[PDB]
Design a protein around this ligand. Structure first.
Ligand SMILES: Cc1ccncc1CO
Length: 165
């Protein structure tokens, strides 16, 4: 199971870890991807998870988009977890670097409530441009299921834990 996590609340846990290495170790039922509406996994967490699947995540995602069209910002879809997890929950948080509504971050986290346990990154953090402290607050105040957050950056992990209210 998940090991080395710091408990923040009844259901939210956090660890300074690479989510790809964490997924390969745990093989969780659900790994969350920090997706965009087109499921184009170029960089950030998405680029890293896709590279770990040898691009199989991108091939599956292109077929999904060809059939269904783009996701909504704040929305999600369940696809295969490939070699990382049973499933990948592709969740689109708002990208503030694309001028998207930060208010959609709560809607994005609501997708996590459809899964009893998830391994996830902080939505809209990193290259999505939102304040990770704000993302963690929205996570704890929105997600009711068991979420194990992997924060890649050690300095950011320390700042998140030390400032957690
Ligand atoms: C977690 C992560 C995010 C972006 N790039 C690389 C990594 C490591 O796999």
């Amino acid at each position: 199971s998940f090991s080395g996590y710091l408990k923040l609340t009844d259901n939210v846990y956090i660890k300074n870890a690479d989510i790809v290495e964490e997924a390969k170790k745990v093989k969780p039922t659900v790994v969350v991807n920090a997706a965009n509406v087109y499921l184009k996994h170029g960089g950030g967490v998405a680029g890293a998870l896709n590279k770990a699947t040898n691009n199989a995540m991108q091939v599956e995602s292109d077929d999904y988009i060809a059939t269904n069209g783009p996701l909504k910002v704040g929305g999600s879809c369940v696809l295969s977890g490939h070699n990382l997890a049973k499933h990948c929950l592709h969740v689109v948080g708002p990208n503030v670097n694309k001028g998207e509504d930060i208010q959609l971050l709560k809607s994005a986290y609501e997708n996590f409530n459809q899964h009893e346990v998830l391994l996830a990154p902080l939505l809209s953090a990193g290259i999505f441009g939102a304040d990770p402290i704000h993302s963690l607050r929205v996570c704890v105040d929105t997600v009711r299921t068991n979420v194990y957050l992997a924060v890649f950056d050690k300095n950011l992990y320390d700042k998140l834990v030390s400032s957690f209210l």
